[PDB]
Amino acid sequence: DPTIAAGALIGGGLIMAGGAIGAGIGDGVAGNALISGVARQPEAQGRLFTPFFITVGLVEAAYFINLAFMALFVFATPV
Amino acid sequence: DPTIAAGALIGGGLIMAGGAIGAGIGDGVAGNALISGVARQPEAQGRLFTPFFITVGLVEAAYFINLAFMALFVFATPV
Amino acid sequence: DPTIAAGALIGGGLIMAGGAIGAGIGDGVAGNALISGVARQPEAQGRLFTPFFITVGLVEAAYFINLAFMALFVFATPV
Amino acid sequence: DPTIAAGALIGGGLIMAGGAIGAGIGDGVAGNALISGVARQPEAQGRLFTPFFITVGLVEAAYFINLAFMALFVFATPV
Amino acid sequence: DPTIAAGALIGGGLIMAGGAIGAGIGDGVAGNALISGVARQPEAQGRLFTPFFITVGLVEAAYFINLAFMALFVFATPV
Amino acid sequence: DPTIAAGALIGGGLIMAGGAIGAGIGDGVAGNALISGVARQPEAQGRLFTPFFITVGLVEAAYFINLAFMALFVFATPV
Amino acid sequence: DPTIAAGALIGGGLIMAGGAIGAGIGDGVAGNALISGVARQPEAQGRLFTPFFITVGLVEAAYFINLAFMALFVFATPV
Amino acid sequence: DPTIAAGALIGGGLIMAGGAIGAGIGDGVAGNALISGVARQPEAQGRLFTPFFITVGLVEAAYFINLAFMALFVFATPV
Amino acid sequence: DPTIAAGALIGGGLIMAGGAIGAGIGDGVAGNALISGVARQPEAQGRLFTPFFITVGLVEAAYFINLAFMALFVFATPV
Amino acid sequence: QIEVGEHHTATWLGMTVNTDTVLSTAIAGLIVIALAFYLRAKVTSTDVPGGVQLFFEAITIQMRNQVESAIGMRIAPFVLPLAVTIFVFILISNWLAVLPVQYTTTELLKSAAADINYVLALALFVFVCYHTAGIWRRGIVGHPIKLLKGHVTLLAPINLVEEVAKPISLSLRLFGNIFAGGILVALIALFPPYIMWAPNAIWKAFDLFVGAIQAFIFALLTILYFSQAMEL
Ligand SMILES: COc1nc2ccc(Br)cc2cc1[C@@H](c1ccccc1)[C@@](O)(CCN(C)C)c1cccc2ccccc12
Ligand SMILES: COc1nc2ccc(Br)cc2cc1[C@@H](c1ccccc1)[C@@](O)(CCN(C)C)c1cccc2ccccc12
Ligand SMILES: COc1nc2ccc(Br)cc2cc1[C@@H](c1ccccc1)[C@@](O)(CCN(C)C)c1cccc2ccccc12
Ligand SMILES: COc1nc2ccc(Br)cc2cc1[C@@H](c1ccccc1)[C@@](O)(CCN(C)C)c1cccc2ccccc12
Ligand SMILES: COc1nc2ccc(Br)cc2cc1[C@@H](c1ccccc1)[C@@](O)(CCN(C)C)c1cccc2ccccc12
Ligand SMILES: COc1nc2ccc(Br)cc2cc1[C@@H](c1ccccc1)[C@@](O)(CCN(C)C)c1cccc2ccccc12
Ligand SMILES: COc1nc2ccc(Br)cc2cc1[C@@H](c1ccccc1)[C@@](O)(CCN(C)C)c1cccc2ccccc12
Structure with a gap:
C-alpha cells in the first residue's frame, strides 16, 4: 500500500x-x-x-474537474 | 503490481x-x-x-482526449 | 509511514x-x-x-484552495 | 517488467x-x-x-505525433 | 527521515x-x-x-507565502 | 536495464x-x-x-530534432 | 546521507x-x-x-533569493 | 550504473x-x-x-549548448 | 556515491x-x-x-549562472 | 482489457496485408467512385445543378482558388485533381467512423486512417509527386540544390530538416488524430449501455468536424508543398 499511496499523493x-x-x-x-x-x-x-462569464465558466470547469480527480486519487484511490 | 499502480497514478x-x-x-x-x-x-x-466555438471546440477536443487517457491509465491500466 | 510522508511533501x-x-x-x-x-x-x-477585484478574486480563490489542499496533504495526510 | 511498465506510464x-x-x-x-x-x-x-486551418494543422501535429508515441510507450513499449 | 528529508527538500x-x-x-x-x-x-x-504596487503586492505575497511554506518544509518539517 | 529502460522512457x-x-x-x-x-x-x-515558413521551419526543426533524440533514447539507448 | 544529498541536489x-x-x-x-x-x-x-530598474529589481530579487536557498540546500543542507 | 545511467537519461x-x-x-x-x-x-x-537573425541566433545558441550538454550526459557521462 | 550521482545529473x-x-x-x-x-x-x-543588449545581458546572465551551477553539480558535486 | 495494434491479417504476395483497412479503403473508394459516376450522369451546365454537383463544384472551386493563389493553374493544373481526390477520399474514409459498427468489443470496420500503411500511402505519394513536379520545374539537379538553399542559404541544415519533416508530419498528424478516435471508442465502450451512449454521441459528433478538418488540412498543406517545390 505505501507505494500506491505515495503515487496517489504525487x-x-x-x-x-x-x-x-x-x-x-x-x-x-x-x-x-x-x-x-x-x-x-x-x-x-x-x-x-x-x-x-462564458470564458470563466470554461476555465473554472477545468479547475473543478481536476479538483474532482485529485479528490478521487487521494480519498478513493482508483487502483 | 504496486510499482505499476504508482506509475499509473503519477x-x-x-x-x-x-x-x-x-x-x-x-x-x-x-x-x-x-x-x-x-x-x-x-x-x-x-x-x-x-x-x-470552433477555437474552444478544438481546445476541448484535446482536453477530452487527455481525460479519456487519464481514465484509461487509472481504471483500465494499459500494462 | 516514511514513503507516504515523502509523497505527501512532494x-x-x-x-x-x-x-x-x-x-x-x-x-x-x-x-x-x-x-x-x-x-x-x-x-x-x-x-x-x-x-x-472580480478577476483577482477568481485567481486568489485558486491559490487559497491549493493552499488548503497542501495543508491537508502535509498536516492531515489523506492516507 | 514492473519498473519498465512504471517508466512507460510516467x-x-x-x-x-x-x-x-x-x-x-x-x-x-x-x-x-x-x-x-x-x-x-x-x-x-x-x-x-x-x-x-494551416495554423491549426501545424499546432495539432505537436499533439497527434505525441499521441502516436505515447500509445507506442503504453501499448507496445519500446523495451 | 532520510526518505522524509529527501521529500522535504524536493x-x-x-x-x-x-x-x-x-x-x-x-x-x-x-x-x-x-x-x-x-x-x-x-x-x-x-x-x-x-x-x-497593488499588482506587485499581490504577486510578492504569493512569493512570500511560498517562501514561508518552503521554510516550514525544510527547517520544521510537518512530519 | 530494468532501471536504465525506465530512465530511457522517462x-x-x-x-x-x-x-x-x-x-x-x-x-x-x-x-x-x-x-x-x-x-x-x-x-x-x-x-x-x-x-x-521560415519561422515554422525553425520551430518544427526543434520538435523534430527532439523526436530524433527521443527515438535514440528508447530504441537504441546510449547505455 | 546519500538519499538526503540526492534530495538536496534535485x-x-x-x-x-x-x-x-x-x-x-x-x-x-x-x-x-x-x-x-x-x-x-x-x-x-x-x-x-x-x-x-524598479521592475528588474523585483525580478532579480526573486533570482538572487532562489540562488541563496539553492546554495543553502546543497552546501549547508537543512537536514 | 543502472542508477547513474537512468539519472543521465532523465x-x-x-x-x-x-x-x-x-x-x-x-x-x-x-x-x-x-x-x-x-x-x-x-x-x-x-x-x-x-x-x-540576431534574435534567432541568441535563441538557437541556448538550444545548441543544451544539446551539447545532453550529449555529454548520455554519451560521455560526467560521473 | 551512485544515488548522489543520479541526483547530481537530474x-x-x-x-x-x-x-x-x-x-x-x-x-x-x-x-x-x-x-x-x-x-x-x-x-x-x-x-x-x-x-x-541591456535586456539580453540580464537574460543571458541568468543562463550563464545556471550553466556555471550545472557544471558545479555534475563535475565538482557539492556533496 | 483494451486492444489497439491488432488487424484481421492475411499474406497476399509474401507481404503481410490487413483485411480491415483494405476493405474500408475499398468501401471509401467505391463510395467516391459511385458519387463521381452519379455526377458524370447528372451534371448540367444549362439546367440547375443537383446536390452532388453543388458538392463537387464547391470543393473544385475551393481547391482551384487555393492552387491559383499558391502557384497558378497555368503552371500546376495537375495539382487540382490531386487536391480534390485527397480531400474527398480522406473525408469519406474518416466519416465512415460515424456508422454504428461497434459490437461485443470489436468493430466491423476501422477508419482506414487509423492504420500507418494508409497514411504513408497518401503522404509518400504526395512527397514523390511534389518532388517530381518540383524537378520537372526546378531541374533534375537544380531542384535538389533549391531544397537545400530554401529562402535563406545559411539555414541549409534546417531546410533539409523541413524537407524530411513534411511527409512525417502528413503521415503522423492524420494517423495520430484518427487512431486517437479509434482508442476513445473502445475505452468509452467500457461504460455500461445506460450511460455509454452519451460520451459516444459527444465524441462521434465532434469526430465528424475533426474528420472534415483533417481532410482539409491534408489538401491545403499538399497545395502549399507543391507551391514550395515549384517556386522560381
Ligand atoms: C464544452 O464542453 C465539451 N466540449 C467538447 C468538445 C469536443 C469534445 Br471531443 C468533447 C467535449 C466535451 C465537453 C465537456 C463534456 C460534456 C458532457 C460530457 C462529456 C464532456 C467537458 O469535457 C468540458 C471540459 N472542459 C470544460 C474543461 C466536460 C468533461 C467532464 C465533465 C464536465 C462537466 C461539466 C461540463 C463539462 C464537462
Ligand atoms: C466560479 O466558481 C465556479 N465556477 C464553476 C464553473 C463551472 C464548473 Br463545472 C464548476 C465551477 C465551480 C466553481 C467554484 C465552486 C463553487 C461551489 C462549489 C464548487 C465549486 C470553484 O470551483 C471556483 C474555483 N475557482 C475560483 C478557482 C470553487 C471550488 C472550490 C472551492 C471554492 C470556494 C469558494 C469559491 C469557489 C470555489
Ligand atoms: C486577497 O487576498 C485573498 N483573497 C482571496 C480571495 C478569495 C478567496 Br476563496 C481567498 C482569498 C484569500 C486571500 C488571502 C487571505 C487573507 C486572509 C486569510 C486567508 C487568506 C491570501 O490567500 C492571499 C494570497 N495571495 C495574495 C497570494 C493570503 C493567504 C495566506 C496568507 C496571507 C497573508 C497575507 C495576505 C494574504 C494572505
Ligand atoms: C540555426 O541552426 C543553428 N544555429 C545555431 C546558432 C548558434 C549556435 Br552556438 C549553434 C547553432 C546551431 C544550429 C543548428 C546546428 C546546425 C549544424 C550543426 C549543429 C547545430 C541546430 O542546433 C539548430 C537547432 N534548432 C533549430 C532547434 C541543429 C542541431 C542539431 C541538429 C540539427 C539538424 C538540422 C538543423 C539544425 C540542427
Ligand atoms: C516587495 O517585497 C515584499 N513584498 C511583500 C508583499 C506582501 C507580503 Br505578505 C510579503 C512581502 C514580502 C516582501 C519582501 C520581504 C521584505 C522584508 C521581509 C520579508 C520579505 C520579499 O519577500 C520580496 C521577495 N520578492 C522580491 C521576490 C523578500 C523576501 C526575502 C528576502 C528579501 C530580501 C530583499 C528584499 C525582499 C525580500
Ligand atoms: C551573449 O553571450 C553571453 N553573454 C553573457 C552575459 C552576461 C554574463 Br554574466 C555571461 C554571458 C555569457 C555569454 C556566453 C559566453 C561566452 C563566452 C564564455 C562564456 C559564456 C554564453 O553564456 C551565452 C549563452 N546564451 C547564448 C545561451 C555561452 C555559454 C556557453 C557556451 C557558449 C558558446 C557560444 C556562445 C555563447 C556561449
Ligand atoms: C542585477 O543584478 C542583481 N540584482 C539584484 C537585485 C536584487 C537582489 Br536582492 C539581488 C540582486 C542580485 C544581482 C546580481 C548579483 C550581483 C552581485 C552579487 C550577487 C548578485 C545577480 O544575482 C544577477 C543575476 N541575474 C542577472 C540573473 C548575479 C548573481 C550571481 C552571479 C552574477 C554574476 C554577474 C552578474 C550578476 C550576478
Missing part, C-alpha cells in the same frame, strides 16, 4: 498544480480583456460580463 | 495536469479575444461565437 | 508550486490591464477596481 | 502532458487571431479559415 | 521554483505596463505606482 | 513533452501573426507565407 | 530552474517595454530606466 | 525538454515580429532580417 | 532545462520588440541595440 498534487496554473492564468488572461474594455468604455461593463 | 496525474494547463490557458486566451471583440463591436457578438 | 510541494505560478502570473496579467487603464484614463481608477 | 503521461499544453495553448493563441480578425471584419470569417 | 524546492516563476513573470508582466505607461505619457508616473 | 518522454510545448506554442504564436496579417490585408498572404 | 536544481525561468522571462517581458518605448519616443530612454 | 531528457521549449517559443515569438513587420511595412523584409 | 539537468526556457523565451520576447522597432522606425535600428 499524482493528486500534479492534478491540482496544473489545475491552478490553468485556472489562474486562464482567469487572469480573460479578466485582462474585461478590465481593458471597461477602461475603453465605462458602460460596456454590462455587456462584457457575458463573454467574460 | 502518469494519469501528469495527463490531467497538462490537460488543465492547455485547456484553462487556451480557453482564457480565446475568451480574451471574444471579450475584446464584443468590446469593439457589440452587434458582432452572434457572429463571433462561430470563431469562438 | 505532493504538497507541487500544489503550492502550481498555486504560485497560476496566481503570480494571473495577478500580473490582470494588473497589467489595470495599470494600462489608469495610464489611458486617470478618472477610470474607481470603476476599474470592480473588473480587477 | 513517460507516456509526460508526452501527453506536454502535447496538451503545447496544442491547447497554441490553438487558443491561433484562434485569438481568428476571433480578433472577424471582430475587425465580420465578413472576413471565410478568409481567415485558410490561414487558421 | 517538496521545498518545488515551492520556491513555482514561487520564483510566478513572482518573476508576474513582476515582469506588471512592470511592462508601468514602463509602457511612462513611455506613452510621463506625467502619469505619479498615479501609475498605486496600480503597480 | 527521459524520452521529457524530450517529447518539451518538444510539443515548444512546437505547439511556437507555431500558434507565429500563425497568430499570419492570420492577423491576412485579416488586415487579404492580398498579403503570398508575401507573409515566406516569413511564416 | 531540490536545489528545481530552485535554480524556477529562478532562471522566472527571471529570464520576467526580464525579457520588462525589456520588451523598454525597447518599445525607446522605439516610439527616442528621448524617453533616460526616464524609462526608473520604471525598468 | 537529466539529459530535462536538458533537451527545456531546450526545445525555449527554442520553439523563442523562435515563434521572434518570427511573429518578422511576419507582423512584413505585414505592416511590406518593403521592410530586407532590414528585418538583421534583428530577426 | 539536478544539473533541471538547472539547464530552466536556464534554456528562461533564455530562449526571454531572448525571443526581447527580440520581438527589436524586430518591431526596426519595422516601424527604420532609422531606429541603432539606438535600439542599447535597450536590447
